[PDB]
A paper describes a structure:
Aminoacyl-tRNA synthetases (AARSs), a family of essential protein synthesis enzymes, are attractive targets for drug development. Here we present five unusual crystal structures showing that threonyl-tRNA synthetase (ThrRS) is covalently inhibited by a natural product, obafluorin (OB). OB contains a β-lactone ring with a 2,3-dihydroxybenzamidyl moiety attached to the α position and a 4-nitrobenzyl moiety attached to the β position. When ThrRS catalyzes tRNA aminoacylation, the Zn2+ ion recognizes and binds l-threonine, assisting in the l-threonine activation reaction.
To elucidate the mechanism by which OB inhibits ThrRS, we cocrystallized a fragment of Escherichia coli ThrRS containing catalytic and anticodon-binding domains (residues 242–642) with OB and determined the structure to a resolution of 2.5 Å. In the two catalytic domains of ThrRS homodimer, OB was bound to the active site for Thr-AMP formation. In total, 18 residues in the active center of ThrRS were located within 4.5 Å of OB and thus interacted with it. Interestingly, the four-membered ring of the β-lactone of OB was opened in the ThrRS-OB structure. Instead, the acyl group formed a new ester bond with the phenolic group of Tyr462. In addition, the two hydroxyl groups on the o-diphenol moiety of OB formed two coordination bonds with the conserved catalytic Zn2+ ion of ThrRS. This structure suggests that OB inhibits ThrRS by forming coordination bonds with the Zn2+ ion in the catalytic center of ThrRS, allowing its β-lactone ring to be approached and attacked by the phenolic group of Tyr462, and finally forming a new covalent bond with Tyr462. The ThrRS-OB structure showed that the o-diphenol group of OB occupied the position of l-threonine and replaced it to bind Zn2+ ion and Asp383. At the same time, the conformations of Gln484 and Met332 were changed to accommodate OB. Therefore, the nitrobenzene group of OB occupied the binding site of tRNA A76, which prevented tRNA from entering the active center of ThrRS.
Residue numbers in the entry:
A (entry chain A), B (entry chain B): 242 to 641
Amino acid sequence: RDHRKIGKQLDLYHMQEEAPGMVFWHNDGWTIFRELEVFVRSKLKEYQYQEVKGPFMMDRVLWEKTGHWDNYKDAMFTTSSENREYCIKPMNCPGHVQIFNQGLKSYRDLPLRMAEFGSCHRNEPSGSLHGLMRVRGFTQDDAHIFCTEEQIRDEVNGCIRLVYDMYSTFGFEKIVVKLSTRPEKRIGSDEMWDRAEADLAVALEENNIPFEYQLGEGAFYGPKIEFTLYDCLDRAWQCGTVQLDFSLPSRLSASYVGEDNERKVPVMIHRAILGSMERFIGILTEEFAGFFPTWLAPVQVVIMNITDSQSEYVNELTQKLSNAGIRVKADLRNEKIGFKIREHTLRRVPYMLVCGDKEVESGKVAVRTRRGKDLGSMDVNEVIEKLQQEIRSRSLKQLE
Amino acid sequence: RDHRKIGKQLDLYHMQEEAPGMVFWHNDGWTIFRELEVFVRSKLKEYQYQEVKGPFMMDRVLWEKTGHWDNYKDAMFTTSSENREYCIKPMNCPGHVQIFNQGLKSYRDLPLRMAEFGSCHRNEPSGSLHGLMRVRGFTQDDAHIFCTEEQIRDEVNGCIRLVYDMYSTFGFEKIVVKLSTRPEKRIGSDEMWDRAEADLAVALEENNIPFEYQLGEGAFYGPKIEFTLYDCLDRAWQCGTVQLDFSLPSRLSASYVGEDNERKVPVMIHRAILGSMERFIGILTEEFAGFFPTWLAPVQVVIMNITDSQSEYVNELTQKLSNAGIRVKADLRNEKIGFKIREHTLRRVPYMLVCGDKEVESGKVAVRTRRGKDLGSMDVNEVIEKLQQEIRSRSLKQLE
Ligand SMILES: *C(=O)[C@@H](NC(=O)c1cccc(O)c1O)[C@H](O)Cc1ccc([N+](=O)[O-])cc1
Ligand SMILES: *C(=O)[C@@H](NC(=O)c1cccc(O)c1O)[C@H](O)Cc1ccc([N+](=O)[O-])cc1
Ligand SMILES: [Zn+2]
Ligand SMILES: [Zn+2]
């Protein structure tokens, strides 16, 4: 149950000293990553987010306007061109505010939700690096919500719902929640902090989430909620964050015209659910020990012959399943059927399809799961439909 | 017919002096971009490529092993961490060789086809920058094919087919092809250059492509084929490239076990079809003058009411088309119908659905195209079918 070993075994990714803390995603790991992308994007549609893409580097002058340069310059990668300094982005928030600043906005346009699978880079100390979980380059399931003060509590609600929707998809039901209150050095008045912390507290109350305070741990520009999921070994993983921000939009001249036709600065909410997706793939690898749910498995089906008397029946079925959008391969090698099955069982393929002449003539397939339960011979059309239903529903469990 | 003007009008992207030559994709531009990802990915499945992802930055020591540092150091962004120098990748090729170098390779594994949507960054002089077309940061529809010398012809064939397949989808039918022959300073023997030049020449000959030589214009490590498409204004756009490489894999220690059990160095084919995807979106924007085919339109359908007495029929219709995978939005605003319709015609929405009492009771919609043609009241399920078919087939033409 160690993702670095499973990662090498299943050929998912590798890393090397020429690029410390930066992942090389091989075909099969990248398939997991992209399947996560598709799932998140399905959520962005359902919860009505825009998806944008910002540039990898911006002028360091801009990073000073944010105030982040003064605090976290050392975690930043800088480069040069024509006598200007640029930083490679460690976060997506200012870029999103830059998208927001194009075109006059109106209260009509808020809440405005803006997501990005944003590639970030942080100059992490090399000795702290570890596999997929402490890296220098990661991708974040990142969104920012611009809204009015009246819309905060409804927008946080939506984020809270999103969190439990997505964690439960992976079997994570034990979640611990913490609210981080005002730190010693902060901006804003005590009254503004009073209602900011109240909005986060009330949102969790309307959702029936018990929670607990992390006193003084809040950012200098707002409180936050932090979500911690527990894996099947009862290790805690902080993944989710909803973070209120009353400083950045004003620092970057974001404004909208209000109901009263006066100019107003929007509230910004920062939220990620998986957090860093390389890290989340790491958790999943260990939570599942490599036996990924069908919808995540790099290879969902392998089809095998008994003799060469079925090689083309296999090939036609491989094609048939592929047209159904199933990641399927054929194993027509001249090896014993128990050799092939161990090969693909070691590779954690969810379903092994075997065709003898017994089943070639009837139009069926014999079906074996990776755990070793034999489901016998079923009609191909019924097998394909049952596979699709399992994939579309992102089922954690296989057939029976 | 200028993409930069159209780009601001349709709210596709923007750029700013804080990040010269780097694109901010807004929601509507990023929809186009992502839809091109899905189209390329459809082809990657059909032509059987792996899709991988390499790290964004790599040790400059590795970039010296490739020989690219001597020639192209001035084009590279470089950065420091703990007293090591790193280049942001201007290209994906060395990263893919790193992926190939994990695990011993046998001749059985070739041809190995490896694609990536690679984020590259080149320190282009700022005075040369222009729109989406000459930039500092861009994404490439990249792939590398590792094969044996006996396998080159069939692989180049496969690349030549893919080029004509994709360009055809967009309506580019006039394509000019040029073969760059050996340069004055080069690696390899004349005998090997003779077979390599003939390899590219034979592959085009088998696919009936006439072509022309670009004498002496080859890279020092191989000949190439370059494809130039002509747009509807009859301007020439060089997009596709097929580069044979007989130097890089040996310099980076690639090797396989041959069928004679002697270890050999593989051939690399470098291969891009659209080239820079930003640039391609720019060409498409000018090629269509913003009237994107339905499968690329950021918003495919707008539904509208006559009065308020249909606001809910519109809303259920909107959800009904959303579930069908159609990018549809509803316009329930209190405005005249000719005002709404002009609004969405200026935005180049392909289809405009309108609902009064007549269509609500009947379960139909009045359908209007952006050209201005009325298609009348057809059944809702028949117009969803026709939209799906037009989208799935990536048709350039609309209904009728
Ligand atoms: C303050 O805003 C805080 N942001 C977040 O924690 C955050 C969470 C989830 C999504 C988004 O978009 C967020 O911004 C601040 O960015 C924290 C921070 C700590 C360290 C570094 N660093 O460069 O090592 C950057 C930002
Ligand atoms: C030599 O290999 C040449 N590559 C290509 O032309 C190429 C075309 C399409 C796809 C791929 O993957 C390719 O590698 C070489 O890369 C030429 C070149 C490299 C770097 C720069 N630079 O501005 O740093 C310019 C040209
Ligand atoms: Zn943020
Ligand atoms: Zn290349």
